[PDB]
Structures are given as C-alpha cells and as structure tokens.
Amino acid sequence: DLLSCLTFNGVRNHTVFSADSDSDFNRFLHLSIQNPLFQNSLISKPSAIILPGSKEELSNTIRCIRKGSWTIRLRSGGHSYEGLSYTSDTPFILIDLMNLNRVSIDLESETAWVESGSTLGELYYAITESSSKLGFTAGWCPTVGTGGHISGGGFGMMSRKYGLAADNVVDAILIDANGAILDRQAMGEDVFWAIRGGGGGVWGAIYAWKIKLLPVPEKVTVFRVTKNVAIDEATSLLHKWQFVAEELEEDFTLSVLGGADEKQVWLTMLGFHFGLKTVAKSTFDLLFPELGLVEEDYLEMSWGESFAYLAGLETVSQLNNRFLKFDERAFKTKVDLTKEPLPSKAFYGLLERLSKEPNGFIALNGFGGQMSKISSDFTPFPHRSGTRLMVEYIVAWNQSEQKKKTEFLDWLEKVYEFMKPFVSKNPRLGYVNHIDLDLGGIDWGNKTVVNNAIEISRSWGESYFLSNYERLIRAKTLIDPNNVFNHPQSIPPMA
Numbered sequence: 090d091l092l093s094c095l096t097f098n099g100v101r102n103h104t105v106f107s108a109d110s111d112s113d114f115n116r117f118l119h120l121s122i123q124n125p126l127f128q129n130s131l132i133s134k135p136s137a138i139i140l141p142g143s144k145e146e147l148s149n150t151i152r153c154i155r156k157g158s159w160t161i162r163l164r165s166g167g168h169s170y171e172g173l174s175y176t177s178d179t180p181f182i183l184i185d186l187m188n189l190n191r192v193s194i195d196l197e198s199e200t201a202w203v204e205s206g207s208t209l210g211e212l213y214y215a216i217t218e219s220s221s222k223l224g225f226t227a228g229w230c231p232t233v234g235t236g237g238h239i240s241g242g243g244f245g246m247m248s249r250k251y252g253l254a255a256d257n258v259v260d261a262i263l264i265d266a267n268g269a270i271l272d273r274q275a276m277g278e279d280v281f282w283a284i285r286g287g288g289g290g291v292w293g294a295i296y297a298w299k300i301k302l303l304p305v306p307e308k309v310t311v312f313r314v315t316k317n318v319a320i321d322e323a324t325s326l327l328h329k330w331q332f333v334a335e336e337l338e339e340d341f342t343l344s345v346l347g348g349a350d351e352k353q354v355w356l357t358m359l360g361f362h363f364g365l366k367t368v369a370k371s372t373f374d375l376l377f378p379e380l381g382l383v384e385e386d387y388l389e390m391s392w393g394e395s396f397a398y399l400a401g402l403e404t405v406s407q408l409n410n411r412f413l414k415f416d417e418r419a420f421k422t423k424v425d426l427t428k429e430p431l432p433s434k435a436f437y438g439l440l441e442r443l444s445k446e447p448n449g450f451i452a453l454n455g456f457g458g459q460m461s462k463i464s465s466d467f468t469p470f471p472h473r474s475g476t477r478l479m480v481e482y483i484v485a486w487n488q489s490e491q492k493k494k495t496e497f498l499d500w501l502e503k504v505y506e507f508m509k510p511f512v513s514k515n516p517r518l519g520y521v522n523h524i525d526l527d528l529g530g531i532d533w534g535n536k537t538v539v540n541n542a543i544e545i546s547r548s549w550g551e552s553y554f555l556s557n558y559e560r561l562i563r564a565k566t567l568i569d570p571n572n573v574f575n576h577p578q579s580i581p582p583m584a
C-alpha cells in the first residue's frame with residue numbers, strides 16, 4: 090500500500106479519498122482550489138492527498154508513489170488556470186505543498202531561500218518585515234504560489250526594472266523522479282536553466298528557490314485610479330497608453346485593468362515609480378497628461394505597502410494570509426503578446442465587446458525596459474526585445490451566474506478571434522504561466538500520440554518558448570527521462 094510505504098519512511102500527513110461531502114479529505118482538496126471552474130462534483134478527484142513537511146518527506150513521498158501506478162500532481166498555490174495541479178484523467182496522488190511555506194531571509198547576502206509552498210504574499214511580507222530597502226520582482230496576485238509561478242517565469246509590476254521572478258533565481262533544490270535532492274550544482278546548468286521558466290509539473294518537485302533580493306527605495310510612489318469614461322476617450326487613452334507604457338524608463342510602470350457596461354467604460358490605471366512623487370508626477374504630466382491625474386492620486390509608501398495597495402489589499406498584513414479570498418469567481422482567461430502597435434480600432438472593438446459583457450475584463454502590461462535587455466535565451470521565457478505588450482482577456486462569474494457559463498466562454502472565444510490580426514502571429518505567442526489547453530494536449534496513455542509527441546507538442550511549446558523549445562526537451566530527457574512529471578502540455582522527453 091502507498092500508505093504503508095509513506096509510514097515506513099516517516100511521512101504521516103496524508104488523507105485518502107472520502108465520499109463524505111465534508112470529510113477532511115474534501116476540506117484539504119478544496120482549500121487551495123483557486124479557480125471554482127474546477128471545483129464541481131464531476132471533476133476528477135485525487136485518490137489521496139499528501140502534505141510533506143520537509144524536503145526529506147517530499148523525497149520519500151515521490152519514492153513511494155513510484156512503487157505504485159499513480160500520476161503525481163504537485164500543488165503549491167493552486168492558481169493553475171486549467172486546474173492542472175489537482176486534476177488528472179488518470180488516477181492520481183495530490184502532493185500539496187502548503188506546509189512547505191518557510192521563507193528564510195539572509196540579510197548578509199541579500200538572498201532568500203523560499204520553500205515552494207510559499208505564496209507571493211507570504212514572500213513579500215517576509216521581505217518587508219526584514220528590511221525597508223529590499224524587494225522582489227514577481228506577480229501581482231498575492232495568493233499565487235511560488236512553486237508554479239517561478240517555475241513558469243513570473244511577471245509583475247517591477248518586471249520592467251528587474252525582469253521575471255525566474256530571472257532572479259540563483260539556486261534551487263529540485264527533488265527528481267527518484268527522490269534525489271539536487272541543488273544547482275547537482276542538477277547541472279541545463280536543468281537549472283529549464284526550471285527557471287520552463288513550466289511547473291515537468292522537471293520534478295521544486296522544494297525551494299534561492300532568490301536574489303533586489304534594492305528598493307524606502308519610499309516608492311504608486312497610484313490606483315479608476316477613470317469612468319465613454320468609449321471615445323477610453324479608446325484614445327488605451328491607444329496612447331501602449332506607447333507610454335513600453336517607452337517609460339525602467340523606474341516606472343503603468344498598467345491597466347479595464348472593463349465596461351454599455352456606455353460606461355472603466356479603466357483602472359496602476360502606476361509604480363521607483364522613487365518620490367515629485368518625479369513621478371512630473372513624468373506623467375509630461376508623457377500622459379490625458380490621464381488627468383492630480384497630486385492627491387500619487388501616494389508615497391514602502392515597497393511592501395505598494396504591492397499590497399496595487400493589488401487592492403487592506404494592509405501589508407493581508408499579504409501573509411494565503412487563504413484570504415482574493416477573487417472567488419470561476420474564470421477562463423486567454424493572453425496575447427504583441428510585436429506591432431495596436432491600431433486604435435483594435436482597442437475600440439475590444440471596448441465594444443467589453444461593453445456587451447460586464448463580466449469580462451482586460452489586463453494590459455507593457456514590456457520594454459529590462460525585459461528588452463535580457464536575452465531571449467537567458468531563461469526559457471523568450472519574449473524579450475521586440476515584445477511590446479502583454480494583453481490578458483478574462484471572463485469571470487459567481488455561482489449564481491453559472492447558467493451563463495457557455496455564453497461567457499463564447500464571448501471570450503470571440504474576443505480572442507477578434508484580436509487575431511493585431512497580435513503576434515506565426516506563431517501566436519503565449520506564456521506558460523497562462524497555460525491554455527485550447528492549444529491542444531497530449532494523452533500520455535495514447536501510444537500513437539506519444540510516438541509523435543515532439544511534433545504534436547510544438548503547437549503550444551513554440552508559442553510558450555519559441556527557439557528555447559529544443560533545449561527544454563534536452564533538459565527534460567536528462568532530468569526526467571521516464572516522464573514521471575507530466576500533464577497535457579508538459580515538455581516531452583526523447584524516446
């Protein structure tokens with residue numbers, strides 16, 4: 090039995106499947122499901138849930154599962170857009186990493202070791218508690234897990250200054266298919282490259298990341314201002330925004346959340362400056378006076394405060410609450426990367442479509458800055474110089490709106506089709522943290538498909554990784570030749 094192996098090896102925190110609706114099993118299962126779309130009774134459920142409390146327990150958990158016929162599923166923060174950390178078409182064991190949430194800050198080296206169950210919020214909180222002059226570049230959502238996020242890159246409000254989370258990883262502990270405990274030196278440079286953006290659930294189980302902490306001023310300046318406007322003005326704002334955003338010096342970021350409802354358009358402008366408010370306002374007065382920002386819009390605060398504020402949290406303390414409900418809605422999302430400026434009519438049509446579906450919203454980010462100075466092959470995320478914007482389309486709904494699911498998904502499909510001519514093409518680019526199964530998927534139990542796995546997987550592989558796809562395959566073959574870590578879009582090993 091799996092349990093007997095786990096016990097012989099000192100892993101005690103485990104719970105087998107139970108039909109009891111409010112069993113402990115179900116409590117643990119649902120605790121970290123961050124997309125309600127995959128919560129219902131018709132979804133696949135794990136045969137057991139294991140909560141390892143140490144790297145040794147993680148190693149032995151993997152070793153035991155292998156003595157059986159199980160598919161391994163790793164979950165850190167549970168934010169997978171496609172629920173790939175807690176679903177599987179084959180019988181599976183869920184390894185939940187929530188107990189591995191220790192952050193160890195070394196102020197003498199200005200680095201940190203971060204267990205992979207730690208959320209972004211927990212990490213940010215730990216950093217701000219330790220120092221007023223250090224921060225880290227990662228995503229905007231505080232409940233996202235470092236396990237999946239850093240594995241896939243990790244883009245956020247300081248990426249124009251410092252790049253992705255993965256661009257600032259200097260060591261890691263990877264537990265491989267045989268339970269080996271491997272640091273950077275042990276896994277080798279190809280594998281250490283692959284894990285820094287090559288996607289979660291593919292290489293082994295990351296136990297911990299070693300990150301370089303980055304300088305921040307004791308006071309940064311942010312704004313969070315929602316413009317309530319009509320479509321003509323919203324269109325001209327977004328059309329100018331794209332140029333301001335990509336062209337801003339690296340010490341500034343201007344991003345947008347947007348939506349609409351008939352004649353009313355809302356654009357939430359999210360601003361960040363690595364410095365004081367005089368310089369911040371001088372810059373936006375010059376470059377984007379159309380925003381109509383006023384002195385009272387600019388707030389000076391600590392870096393930690395700024396990340397809580399930009400995400401709409403009440404306090405810095407809230408960063409440290411991994412179970413704080415950030416957004417309890419089922420959702421589907423798609424993303425585009427661009428290479429050419431978007432014409433005005435693209436924003437106009439996007440806004441028209443938003444006005445017809447108030448449950449939809451967009452998130453807009455400029456690249457440029459440091460993102461253009463990092464080589465396309467420095468880490469697996471290839472969208473560097475030449476990449477102008479990242480454009481996210483989201484539709485989300487609560488339980489009372491479930492009847493409209495098909496309609497919501499149809500709306501999103503049509504938005505993505507509308508944007509096709511304006512965004513990257515040949516191929517249409519994507520981002521592995523924004524995993525999208527519409528691109529297709531591999532059934533690893535299907536021999537004819539597996540025989541041709543490399544060609545088949547190119548569909549999504551090249552969209553996520555472009556020319557880096559080849560090295561990823563070589564790295565996969567080195568570290569997981571038997572494909573113990575797999576999912577519908579995992580990098581294939583060579584046969």
Ligand SMILES: *Cc1cc2c(nc3c(=O)[nH]c(=O)nc-3n2C[C@H](O)[C@H](O)[C@H](O)COP(=O)(O)OP(=O)(O)OC[C@H]2O[C@@H](n3cnc4c(N)ncnc43)[C@H](O)[C@@H]2O)c(*)c1C
Nearest residue numbers: 165166167168169174228229230234236237244289290295
């Ligand atoms: C829900 C959500 C996601 C967001 C949000 N904001 C983002 C942002 O501002 N920038 C971004 O770059 N991404 C943002 N995303 C998307 C997330 O980045 C991705 O959804 C992350 O991959 C999520 O990571 P995590 O929360 O850990 O999700 P899981 O579902 O647990 O795992 C994803 C994937 O990775 C594997 N995996 C988890 N843990 C490990 C370890 N330790 N080792 C190897 N592999 C691991 C899983 O098996 C799965 O395959 C904002 C919001 C609200």
Ligand SMILES: *[C@@H]1O[C@H](CO)[C@@H](O[C@@H]2O[C@H](CO)[C@@H](O[C@@H]3O[C@H](CO)[C@@H](O)[C@H](O)[C@@H]3O)[C@H](O)[C@H]2NC(C)=O)[C@H](O)[C@H]1NC(C)=O
Nearest residue numbers: 101102103104113116117120139140141142187188189412
């Ligand atoms: C396996 O891991 C789970 C998840 O961490 C463990 O459950 C957790 O146990 C801790 C310690 O008992 C709980 O801490 C306390 O919770 C109570 C409220 O219920 C509170 O009074 C204390 O101040 C503290 O918060 C924690 O709630 C709980 N977490 C969850 C989500 O259940 C569990 O102990 C482990 N199981 C085994 C067999 O080791």
Ligand SMILES: COc1cc2c(cc1O)[C@@H]1Cc3ccc(OC)c(O)c3CN1CC2
Nearest residue numbers: 229344346416418420422452454481483485
């Ligand atoms: C399920 O509900 C949500 C889903 C998602 C987000 C927020 C939600 O509430 C965030 C919103 C957001 C805001 C600003 C960003 O850059 C500054 C950004 O990249 C994102 C990304 N997305 C990822 C999808």
Ligand SMILES: *[C@@H]1O[C@H](CO)[C@@H](O)[C@H](O)[C@H]1NC(C)=O
Nearest residue numbers: 530532534535536537538539
């Ligand atoms: C394998 O996959 C192919 C292509 O998706 C499918 O047509 C076929 O039915 C599958 N074969 C088996 C035996 O499952």
Ligand SMILES: [Mg+2]
Nearest residue numbers: 109110111112
């Ligand atoms: Mg009961």
